[PDB]
Amino acid sequence: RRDWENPGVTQLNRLAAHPPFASWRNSEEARTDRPSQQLRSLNGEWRFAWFPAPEAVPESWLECDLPEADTVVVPSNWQMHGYDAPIYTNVTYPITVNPPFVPTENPTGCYSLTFNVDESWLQEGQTRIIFDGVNSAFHLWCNGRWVGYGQDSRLPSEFDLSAFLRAGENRLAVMVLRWSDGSYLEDQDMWRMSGIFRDVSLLHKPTTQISDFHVATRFNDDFSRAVLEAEVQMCGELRDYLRVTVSLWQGETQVASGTAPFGGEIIDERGGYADRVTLRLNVENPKLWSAEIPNLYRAVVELHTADGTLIEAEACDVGFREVRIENGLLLLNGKPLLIRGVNRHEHHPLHGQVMDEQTMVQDILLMKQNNFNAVRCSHYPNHPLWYTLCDRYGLYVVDEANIETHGMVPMNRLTDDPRWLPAMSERVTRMVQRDRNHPSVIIWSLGSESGHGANHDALYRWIKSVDPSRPVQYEGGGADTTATDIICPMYARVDEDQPFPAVPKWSIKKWLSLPGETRPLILCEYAHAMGNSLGGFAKYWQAFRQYPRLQGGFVWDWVDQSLIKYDENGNPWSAYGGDFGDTPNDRQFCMNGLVFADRTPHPALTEAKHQQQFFQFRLSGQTIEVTSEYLFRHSDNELLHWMVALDGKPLASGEVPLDVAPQGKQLIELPELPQPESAGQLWLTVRVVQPNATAWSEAGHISAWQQWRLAENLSVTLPAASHAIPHLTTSEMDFCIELGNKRWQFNRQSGFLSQMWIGDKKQLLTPLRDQFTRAPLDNDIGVSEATRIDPNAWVERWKAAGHYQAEAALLQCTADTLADAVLITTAHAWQHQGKTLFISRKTYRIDGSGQMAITVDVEVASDTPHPARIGLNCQLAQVAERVNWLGLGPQENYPDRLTAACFDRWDLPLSDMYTPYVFPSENGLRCGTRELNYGPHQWRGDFQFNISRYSQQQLMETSHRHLLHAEEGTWLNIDGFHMGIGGDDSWSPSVSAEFQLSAGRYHYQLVWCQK
Amino acid sequence: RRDWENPGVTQLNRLAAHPPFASWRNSEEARTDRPSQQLRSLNGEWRFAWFPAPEAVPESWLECDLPEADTVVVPSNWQMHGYDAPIYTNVTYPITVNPPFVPTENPTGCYSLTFNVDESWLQEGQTRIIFDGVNSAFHLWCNGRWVGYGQDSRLPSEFDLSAFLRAGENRLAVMVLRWSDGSYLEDQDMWRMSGIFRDVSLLHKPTTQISDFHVATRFNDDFSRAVLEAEVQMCGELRDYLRVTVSLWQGETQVASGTAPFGGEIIDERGGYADRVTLRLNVENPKLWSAEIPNLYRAVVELHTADGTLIEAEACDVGFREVRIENGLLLLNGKPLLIRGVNRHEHHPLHGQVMDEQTMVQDILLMKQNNFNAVRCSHYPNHPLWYTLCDRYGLYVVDEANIETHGMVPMNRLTDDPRWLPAMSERVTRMVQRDRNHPSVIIWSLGSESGHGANHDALYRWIKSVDPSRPVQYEGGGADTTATDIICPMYARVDEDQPFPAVPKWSIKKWLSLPGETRPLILCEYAHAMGNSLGGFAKYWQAFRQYPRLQGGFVWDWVDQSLIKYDENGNPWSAYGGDFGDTPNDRQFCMNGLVFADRTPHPALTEAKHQQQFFQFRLSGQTIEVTSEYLFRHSDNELLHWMVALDGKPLASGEVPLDVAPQGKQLIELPELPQPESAGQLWLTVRVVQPNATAWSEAGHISAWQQWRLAENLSVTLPAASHAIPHLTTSEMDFCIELGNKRWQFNRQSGFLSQMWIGDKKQLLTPLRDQFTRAPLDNDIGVSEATRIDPNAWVERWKAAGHYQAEAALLQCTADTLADAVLITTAHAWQHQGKTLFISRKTYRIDGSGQMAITVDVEVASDTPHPARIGLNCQLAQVAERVNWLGLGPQENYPDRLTAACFDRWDLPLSDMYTPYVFPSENGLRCGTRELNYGPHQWRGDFQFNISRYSQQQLMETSHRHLLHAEEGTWLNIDGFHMGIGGDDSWSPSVSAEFQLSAGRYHYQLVWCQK
Ligand SMILES: [Mg+2]
Ligand SMILES: [Mg+2]
Ligand SMILES: [Mg+2]
Ligand SMILES: [Mg+2]
Ligand code: NA
Ligand code: NA
Ligand code: NA
Ligand code: NA
Ligand code: NA
Ligand code: NA
């Protein structure tokens, strides 16, 4: 038999799925969730042997350890140890599409373990083995005898080892295949790996035992009364003296307990379940669970005899919450939700897809601190601990079944095929049985990107029957099919329609109102954060607040999926698709996160945080209107710090206490603000500050902020008197201005400022020229490759138009002396093959105060692709340590991603002005700047800038950030105007009309001085 | 691998289900349904060796033919050959309830065939073998090499033998097991049999082939325009010259044709099915299919090259019809159906469960002739021809999956278990894939008696997704769950509620109007025709006609499930549960048919035909209003014949032609009817004759009748004043009365007419005594057995009150002489344990004419169960060959089943006054009798009688009809009143209260005279 090429066999001898069991033998140990003696980790060192195919496994391996096998830590993905290559493919299957068959050359891992089992474990009761995750299919041996089989990489396979074990030395023999018929249902946009990557353990249950238990919580209309309904089922010998007790605990206070013997209600003509019992517990004024306040009770479930003897105990954390859809709104406890969610793959840069508590808690803290309240389990059920943490910390969860068949043609080839229904069901039904008692799971998901097929319709119904307490969503087949309670598009834009045949992505605003549509809209994927991205994120959040039925979305995605490789010297660098010799691959498309693989925030995470704020503000006069977007809590750990600044100088600060009810408003009347005579722009800045520590945040944590311009006083008073006058020199091929020790040199042949001198010091390493291009971002390249061109992508439009190879051909270069200034006047035309693309006309005005005033006027041809930027660049000579600017900051910000950034006086080390994207691109830009200081230099006016040791030319030629060499001096890019960065998706142009540089005529002015 | 003990493996290497294939290579043969050379039968002589378990089967059998093995016909059930005992069991599984395990002792059939396959079949193309039905699991080998395995007794299993066959002689090894994990899903109330009971055949398709086609016909509002849509799916190498032509044929006229290349519409983001095409055909004023007019078109699918060269062709019969539920009514072509239906089991008395065309046509002819329009495939997909004949002859079909699990406790134990969904789905999806092109299939069913579990829900929605053109029904879990489109109870009564907890059976009239409820109600099982049953069948039909949403039902059931056994003298007898040594068993409960196993009508059938009439009648004065219950057809083959008759003798007749529109009316005025002066009662009698023959009926066929009491003039004139006067001789213990050559012997110690003489010849073998009991019917018995008494049932109520062993005590016996007559007055009091049950007060009166007038006055104790009858019986010494009566007839009729009988003079043999019910009971009764003639004897009055060679005592002591011996003389029971027979169900008291003898006081009068 080739069970791994048979989609109608998914398991052999596998025990039924159930909610997490520990089998405590003490009620107090179960109530506190203390570790159980009856659950035993087998995590640790195992033997591992690699094989190119199952047939190459020697018969001897079932009995004795192979002499050339190494010793490795389980759990692990074996690719992370280097026995073979990890593959990153997005859509295309990493194997040939021939369902159900896999390649004969099928990488085969041979894990083995020697372990002990106490005598007392085998005297009575049942001993089983839990493989929490094995990718992708495996057979199992115990002491050499055959035990069983299992598929689905992301759910606990369980087998009964009772008859197989003997007291003392036992050996496990686990054969793990890389590719299986299970691989066809497992085509997620992630690294393709394999091996025992989750916990292995033993659990001991008595013969008479709890086999399954369901907890439900139903409420009245005001949520003041609740009934906890617990269904318990048993295995073993049924006896009249058997009892079940469910107790509910508020920490240490017991709030309710009930007892009854087995035998349920009459359900049909043949009676009731004799081996089942349902206990109903009344709970008055229950403390409700939500992400805002994760109030939890402990439910203890005991199997005991009538005379008192405990048999075993199970327990779970219980959240009293109601999830329902009514009138088109998705309600948590009778209030409409606003999902501030993110998608999250289980990924670690070292360990691969192996998870741990530290990495899980760090992610959860980072989400909660950045105003997130939900996570999607993209695209598989997670490690069992994950849910316990969302139960305890407070994050809504979409639990998603392990089905993705993206590579199929058409995408629903398998999911409408009834020969594939059994395997699909096993993946939905087993998720539900495992995770159903977790309060944090508010929505089930049928999978990801597998079109729409009858199987989705069938298993949609299955869940609705089995668990009415949760809506079901599925995006496939157009996001609004009959297999979903929620319209859940991906990369659907706010205002723009995308009318693809069969599966259009309508504008989310429009979608809601399509004839006969009633359902809530929550995107399962939006704001593709690949590279420099999240442009237009504000436009999403505005719409969400405005439209009741737009109830938020899940950002794609949380963390970059880059792996760590090492160089000759042994220095670690971040690798992406294709860096392991994996072919075919999809390169940098694995890197879509709001954080780097080490959990360092991308600049995008701050924009997300700012838009997802739970407090909104309005200013009228000098009153501040504060609206709380919480649904349940008061603002009982919140304070408001306000400050007013004149061009960076603080004038008055103050802190007012916040007492805002959920959905409520507070009016803070500010004191008389001081109006200064001084010329400049007044700005108000407010902050919500959490004064006390929480489980997820430090004391003094900032949760929300906002700025308004207050008064502005324009400078009327004249520039300070200068009697010095710059002297013009006119040579055959140079214009040269001179004042004191300051010397400006304009090349009469090229037309640019070719060199500057302060004393006998060179200030420039290249000439100050115009720049209309940028180093392409990931949103600029799209799916384009040098081997398969996508003409629609921005980068290609620019390329073919000759934007990049444009030769500046000078038209005019004259100089004129004024009473107290020298006026240089230049004019250039960047041409490509007879076609004039841009025309720069400048005026340089050096005067007797030392300052060089620059006036640029650019014409852009209407029938050329809009330019990426309109500004100038130069390589300076100085390498200063600090960048000090007045403008929007402190973190990186672009025209379509800058609500987060505040205006003020920012001083940073030079290296913070560069953003280390693994795929190097244009970066570090800061918008809305009125002053930039670098060493002796100072630029004034109104512009955008980035500054670093990296030329655009290098950043566009370098594929990996670790290959980047710091150049001589400092590259400076000053743009009067810079295109948007986009982000709605990353496979088609996503920069919005208002952030394209379409105007045709642009102007800016820059003052260059010394201080 | 114990595959037969695992629900996760239902097949191995089995090809996907599809509609009937033939793989014609000639378009014309395909169109006319001509036999195909590419589809060979493998029926006939096979080798068979029985085994106690699969372990006992030797390895040599895969290679060499076994010597002890016999040569038997295939298809067959090996029980019918006598290899082991057939088992009839109703609810309780024949095996121990321990899913998914079966008894290690597992009857195992070894079928082996050697056969010739021509060389051209192996060169190119695909060669497959089809087992249309193997019960219940089987492994398959070809030439010693293993091919595959299959489950589900009632759906075809197909395997590709291409790589296994050889040029020359090939050998087949089929290991058929009686018990497997599928047996748990096959708990139908029927004889449990095993073996290859359906056609085995070999099919040769090309490599580039049609693999699937779906036909769908949608309509405009008035059905004057239709669109035929044909989805055609291919397998093999896809080339740009491959084309599909689908042509529709009306007999010999091509009404439409369409040609397309492969390449469906885009269905999702990954493109579309390149292996599929949809051809659409317009049809103007199509000929609509129905059970009334089975208009059938013919669709021919041609797979061919672009130049003309045929590759292959398929076809099916296409009926233009639409099934939809609107506003609560099931509409067939926008008109509300009234389902005159029946359940039919595939059962033959000799061949067990092997179906043939002859018997199928006989069933269908018999049904259509008896006013049935619908049939339910209880409880599994039928032989593939059943659908073809139902298509052509015109019967609405409920196609039911092979799923019953009645025996589980509770009933839904497996159907609510997600681990059982895979094996459950297979049975529903493979039924739909096969039968979806049959226009007779109007309703899908999810199974029979298997409670209600999520699996039903999941699969209800699967169907609604795949085939939105058919309602889905399923009775489990209370008959109105979320898994059904139709309220389909079983044995819900018309007025009486049965409020069982959890799954109540409401009175059908009440059910429809329950709060919230909107659906139509079509009973899936009613009028349980077990023996002398179907009392109150008239009540169901009064209801169905009065209530739009009561749209009929399916009688349980068509045929008695008796098998033939031969006794000592080679005589064949009908045998039921127990007679094959089968234990535990459910005795005669296998026989619930309207016809006998050999298709001979029960008297019940005429009642069904009458109540399922398509013509309704009312009579006002002399006007006869005819209403049509057809929806589509006119009455073109219809003629109304009428006849008036005074006391039997016709006075007028003649016939008027019929011309009534569907739902229409026709008034017919009678010519002046000659009023006879002679006393008596006139009776109008109409009949609808079909003058022309049909595919289903012989010319002259009666399809509807009805009677009315016209005028009546009573007897005014006195009897002829006789001159004689009978002599009375009073001795010690005799009252002898003599007149001429006639003598009456009254026993003065018993008070009965002990003897009578027509001269010297004795008349009575046993005296004329009162009778208050009857030989209990199946309905009187219920489930009561002599070991498990059902105290509620009528037979037990009667026994325990002492009805059978009741002793007639004499209270009074006096005689008296009158002016022209003798008068005997006899009072009696039947008693039991100090309690009088009945008191009979009679007067016997013999006068000068020589006629005895008996005048009975019966008081029945209020607190005793109501008697089964209140009459008289005696055993005549005469045996005559004709029974001639004036009353309701000719066939058997009782108080609550007589609407079909007519009032007239009826003359039949004695053997027709007895109904040979396999299980013997009270039988042959005729009601509303005014005159009965037997030999010399004549009886006048208003009574119910039966007449036979068998006593009431004999019938109640005899378990089988073939153990009945004719007693001397003839038994005559004249009842003034008889109880109803019931039949709502056969497991609880079901005699409606108006047909019970609850009056507590009864009177009737009889005239006994010689002629
Ligand atoms: Mg498999
Ligand atoms: Mg994908
Ligand atoms: Mg099986
Ligand atoms: Mg049954
Ligand atoms: Na909203
Ligand atoms: Na990706
Ligand atoms: Na506060
Ligand atoms: Na009706
Ligand atoms: Na039966
Ligand atoms: Na009997």
Coordinates of C-alpha atoms in Angstrom, one line a residue, chain A residues 1 3 6 8-9 12 91 266-273 275 406-413 418 421 425 429 433 454 457-458 461-462 465-466 482 502-503, chain B residues 1 3 8-9 12 91 266-273 275 406-413 418 421-422 425 433 454 457-458 461-462 465-466 482 501-503:
Chain A
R1 CA 0.0 0.0 0.0
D3 CA -1.1 5.3 1.8
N6 CA -4.4 7.7 -1.5
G8 CA -9.3 8.4 0.8
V9 CA -6.9 7.2 3.5
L12 CA -4.8 4.4 10.2
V91 CA 1.2 29.6 -5.8
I266 CA -34.2 11.1 25.1
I267 CA -33.1 12.1 21.6
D268 CA -34.8 9.7 19.1
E269 CA -36.9 6.5 19.0
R270 CA -34.0 4.4 20.2
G271 CA -33.4 6.5 23.4
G272 CA -30.6 8.7 24.7
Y273 CA -26.9 8.5 24.9
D275 CA -22.5 7.3 27.9
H406 CA -4.0 27.4 -4.6
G407 CA -1.9 25.7 -7.3
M408 CA -4.9 23.8 -8.8
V409 CA -6.3 24.6 -12.2
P410 CA -9.0 25.8 -11.6
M411 CA -8.4 26.6 -7.9
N412 CA -11.5 24.5 -7.0
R413 CA -10.6 21.4 -8.9
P418 CA -16.4 14.6 -3.9
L421 CA -14.5 15.4 0.6
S425 CA -13.8 16.9 6.4
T429 CA -14.0 18.4 11.8
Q433 CA -13.2 19.1 18.1
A454 CA -19.6 21.7 -2.9
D457 CA -20.8 24.2 1.2
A458 CA -21.1 20.8 3.0
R461 CA -23.2 23.2 7.2
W462 CA -21.4 20.6 9.3
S465 CA -24.8 22.2 13.0
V466 CA -22.1 21.2 15.4
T482 CA -22.8 30.6 0.2
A502 CA -16.1 35.3 -12.0
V503 CA -14.3 36.6 -8.9
Chain B
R1 CA -5.4 -5.1 6.4
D3 CA -10.5 -3.2 5.4
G8 CA -12.0 5.2 6.8
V9 CA -11.6 2.8 3.9
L12 CA -9.4 1.1 -3.0
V91 CA -34.6 -3.2 13.8
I266 CA -13.5 31.1 -16.0
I267 CA -14.7 29.9 -12.6
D268 CA -12.0 31.4 -10.3
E269 CA -8.6 33.2 -10.1
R270 CA -6.7 30.1 -11.4
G271 CA -8.7 30.0 -14.7
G272 CA -11.3 27.4 -15.7
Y273 CA -11.9 23.7 -16.4
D275 CA -11.4 19.5 -19.6
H406 CA -32.1 2.0 12.9
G407 CA -30.4 -0.5 15.3
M408 CA -28.0 2.0 16.9
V409 CA -28.8 3.4 20.4
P410 CA -29.5 6.2 20.1
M411 CA -30.4 6.0 16.4
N412 CA -28.0 8.8 15.4
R413 CA -24.9 7.4 17.1
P418 CA -17.7 13.0 12.2
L421 CA -19.2 11.2 7.6
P422 CA -16.6 9.9 5.0
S425 CA -20.9 10.9 2.1
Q433 CA -23.5 11.1 -9.6
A454 CA -24.7 16.7 11.6
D457 CA -27.0 18.2 7.6
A458 CA -23.7 18.3 5.8
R461 CA -26.3 20.9 1.8
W462 CA -23.9 19.0 -0.5
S465 CA -25.1 22.7 -4.0
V466 CA -24.6 20.1 -6.6
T482 CA -33.1 21.0 9.1
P501 CA -41.0 12.6 23.5
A502 CA -38.2 14.2 21.4
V503 CA -39.6 12.8 18.1

